[model samples]
Target: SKTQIRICFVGDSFVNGTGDPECLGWTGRVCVNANKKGYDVTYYNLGIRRDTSSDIAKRWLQEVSLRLHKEYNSLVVFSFGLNDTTLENGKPRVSIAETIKNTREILTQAKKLYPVLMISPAPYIEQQDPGRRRRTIDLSQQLALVCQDLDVPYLDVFPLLEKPSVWLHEAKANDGVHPQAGGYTEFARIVENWDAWLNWF
Candidate 1:
């Protein structure tokens, strides 16, 4: 019996595919690829600009629950943190500790309800001596460890995509936080090639 995969992608602008003019963001692109393989997938992009873990923590479960059902294979994918790392008057909006805590809660609870995975927040726009970039990288690593403790599959794209890549460059050309189609393509490629992501399908 073939089952329809209902995946709810939750997070910030990256999840929404903000800068991609095609409006298909990475989520859509990946789903499109899957559908092309004759896979039946229903994807919901629950992304919002400028959202932090705290913001997502408040609404993720509620939103996902509404879209998921027992008859379907459902999964929740979370990717956030850039906003949390953003400085507000020289201080991060959300502390790294709190970010980890919220991530822990999201993964633990979501795993209990549905197949859940976490994608590390994307790299921030480059800057000289970018303290926030380092913070994001560190937080992503910490989150990776947290996922390991929870036995959840987590993907860390920060370190790999932050280098001299078109993804980061596109982000730089845009709003300094969001990337366009090319950047999102790179994101999709990462997930598409991940064994963890493939296991679900």
Candidate 2:
């Protein structure tokens, strides 16, 4: 049978492919791969720059609802939290506890509407906030726990894309936050190999 897959990639600038000159971030790249594999894939990138988990929680449902109809093979992929861990005025923008709550709430509700997947936030090169990396790692682990509790498939990309990888190298060369084409291509490769993603087809 022919497959029609509608997926919404929701998160921050990384999801938006902010630094990719090609403008087809990992989300688009992955969908393109699926299409090449003979599936009809429609992907929507709902990524906003510097958006935290709290911000995403506020807007995801309404935004994705319009694009993904229940009748279709709809799925939502969430990947944020770097911005939540960013330091502003000597404190993280969103605390670890609140981030977890927001993630749980967002996934709990989102899964009720459509199948959900979560990709851990990618690494960054924030020099001013040396502790940002640790915080991001912590938040990614916490978010993983929430996904586990909800039974949503979670892909942890932080460790894979940490320093020494193209993801970080490109980000450092570019905006210190968003990566360019090489990085996004690497990200897409990761998703393309993920078993949960393959299961969809």
Candidate 3:
């Protein structure tokens, strides 16, 4: 029998591949790789630029339910927090506690309908916000715990793309927050090799 998978990649600009010239962010690249591996894959990029975890929690269920019907083999991949950690008026746009609460709610709901996976927020240049890296890292850790409690797979890409990696280099070359083609490809590679992702195949 042929394997058919409908996957939704949801979250912020990183998930949207905001800085990639080719426009095939890590989500698209991963789907392409899955196709290469012989899976009939349908990839939906539901990434909204500057959306925080709170924003995603509100929209994810409705948006994902539309594409990932019960009839299909569906999966949901969530990656956010950078936008949530962004500073506004000397405070984070979304506080850490709220982000965790939102994440818990989002994943708990999604898991009931489909397989859920989470990738940590990718790194951005520190020059943009000196506290962003620290905040994002902390959010990722907390998010991981949420996923853990829910038994959902969580991929921490923060340390992998921290510095000297193409993900960061391209981000440096382009926008301080989003990375370009090379960076997206690098991210795709990480997800492609992940044990959780591989288990799907």
Candidate 4:
């Protein structure tokens, strides 16, 4: 029997599709699109709101592994960093260095078992950081670099969608961190169209 495709999308709130009236975040939209295109894949959405890189690192493997077995063709998709960059005690909750380390570890370990892709976190409003959105940009770039070193496919949605008025406007109007239905619709389009994200299917 051929191994069927099974994907585990793991990350934070954006990955969970928070604030979307449709309730199908980009993750759900992407999977639905894939199915419409004739790829029969079983997908597990493991996005936890307020979860940081450390939180993801701690449980990604166990969660994904339980849903898949050696007989299946497995894939893991990761997107986070929003909560990590959020202010706590007047500072970014997760520092740049630790984020890099945590992501590096997850990618390194996960790749050894199944194919992995990293979708860089979405950008919050300018006020989210209170300093110019530097933390979000820096973390996304740093995570990309880590993916490069490990040869993992990374799709950076932050830079690609940052300038789009719909993405920013909806996200701002919703929860400051999450984009509404329109924003997630845009998010899904970006992922479904990306060559890197498409090649995996």
lDDT of 2 by residue, 104-143 (tens): 9999899888988999988876778888888888888888
Candidate 3 matches the true fold with a TM-score of 0.96
Worst 10 residues of 4 by lDDT: 123-132
Cα displacement (Å) at residue 113, model 1: 0.5
Work out the TM-score per prediction: 0.95, 0.96, 0.96, 0.93
* Candidate 3 per-residue C-alpha lDDT over 12-99 given as tens digits, one digit per residue, 9 for 90 to 100: 9889989989989999999988888888898899999999998998898889888998898888999998888888888889999999
The candidate maximizing lDDT is 2
Q: Model 3 segments beyond 4 Å from truth?
A: none
lDDT of 1 by residue, 1-201 (tens): 445789899999989999899999999999999887777889899999889999999999889889998777888889999899888888789999999999998888988889888898887764643787778888988998999999999998876676776787887788776789898998899999888988877
TM-score of 1: 0.95
What's the number of clashes in each of the models?
A: 0, 0, 0, 0
Model 4, residue 74: what's the lDDT? 76
Clashing pairs in 2: none
lDDT for each of the candidates? 0.87, 0.89, 0.87, 0.83
> CA lDDT of 169 in candidate 1?
84
Give the winner by TM-score: 2
- Candidate 1's displacement at residue 8, Å, is 0.1
Clash number for candidate 3? 0
TM-score of predicted structure 4: 0.93
Error of 3 at 13 (Å): 0.6
For model 2, how big is the CA root-mean-square deviation?
A: 1.2
